[PDB]
Amino acid sequence: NLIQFGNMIQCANKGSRPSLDYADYGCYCGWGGSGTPVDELDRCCQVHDNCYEQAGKKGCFPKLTLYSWKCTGNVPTCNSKPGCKSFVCACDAAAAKCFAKAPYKKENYNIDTKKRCK
Amino acid sequence: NLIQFGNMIQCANKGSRPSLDYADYGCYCGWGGSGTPVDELDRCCQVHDNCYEQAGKKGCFPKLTLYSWKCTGNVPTCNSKPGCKSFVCACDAAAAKCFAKAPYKKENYNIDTKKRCK
Ligand SMILES: [Ca+2]
Ligand SMILES: [Ca+2]
Fold first, then answer.
1. To the nearest whole angstrom, how far is the Cα of B17 from the nearest Cα of chain A?
2. Alpha-carbon gap, residue A25 to A46, rounded angstroms
3. Burial of B42: CB neighbours in 10 Å, binned 0-12, 13-18, 19+
4. A115, burial (CB in 10 Å: exposed 0-12, middle 13-18, buried 19+)
5. Backbone angles phi, psi at A109, to 5 degrees
6. In the annotation, is B92 catalytic?
7. Which of A10, B23, B43, B45 lies 20 to 30 Å (CA to CA) from residue B106?
């Protein structure tokens, strides 16, 4: 679920930045997502958006799915069983890893998505 | 539950030390629960053992309790508000913070607790 995703983000970036910092970023991080991502981190979110889309087509509610995961060697690691739990956990762990490698750019945080996204 | 606790430990210590390093340490970290704690870290585990005993007496199974928690700016924070979930979460959050500020001394890892703990 989304609280677990936030926990994963902190795991992957070794506490370098709070997970709330990623909640409304670029064109894709946060509600909806449209246009060309504005930078590397936003590209992570576009991928994540598409993964949640694919989870939804498989009958999952990715914001709600309660999976099992472990922060090990600074990598979010899915324990979960198959199905939605495995699938959504994979979406989140992947995004967490992607966020962690990408540079955070404050100028791209909380942007006017109607003006900058398409 | 124990997996979540491991995740809290990584949250509080910014992933600087694996969770397993704390599973058999001193007289109190892990299955042990007797004698005089061997150092500052071991004292954290003594407090955590006491907390788990209190949880049990509240009717909780602390190793199993499945709570809701958020790693917020490197601080494990309980979201669960009532019952065993909130109480056990608090035990774990406090220990995770305690572990992160205590110095780890490998000479106290995996000691013979039958011999050194009373
Ligand atoms: Ca989005
Ligand atoms: Ca113990």
1. 8
2. 11
3. buried
4. exposed
5. -85, 135
6. yes
7. A10
Contacts of A11 in chain B (CB under 8 A): 7, 10-11, 15, 71
> B70 CA distance to ligand 1 centroid (A)?
21
The terminus-to-terminus CA distance of chain A in angstroms comes to 29
- Resolution of the structure in the document, Å: 1.6
Way it was determined = X-ray
Question: Rounded distance, CA B102 to CA B94, Å?
Answer: 12
After which residues are there C–N gaps above 2.5 Å in chain B? none
Round to whole Å and give the CA distance between B94 and A49.
35
Q: Collect all residues with Cβ–Cβ distance below 8 Å to B48 and sequence separation of at least 6.
A: B28, B91, B92, B94, B95, B98
Go through the domains of chain A in sequence order and give each one's CATH number.
1-118 (1.20.90.10)
How many CB pairs below 8 Å do chains A and B form together?
Answer: 50
- What is the rounded distance in angstroms from the CA atom of residue B107 to the CA atom of residue B26? 9
Q: Judging by beta carbons within 10 Å of its beta carbon (0-12, 13-18, 19+), is residue B105 exposed, middle or buried?
A: middle
Does residue A30 sit in helix, strand or coil?
Answer: coil
Question: For residues B114 and B104, what is the distance between their CA atoms, to the nearest angstrom?
Answer: 21
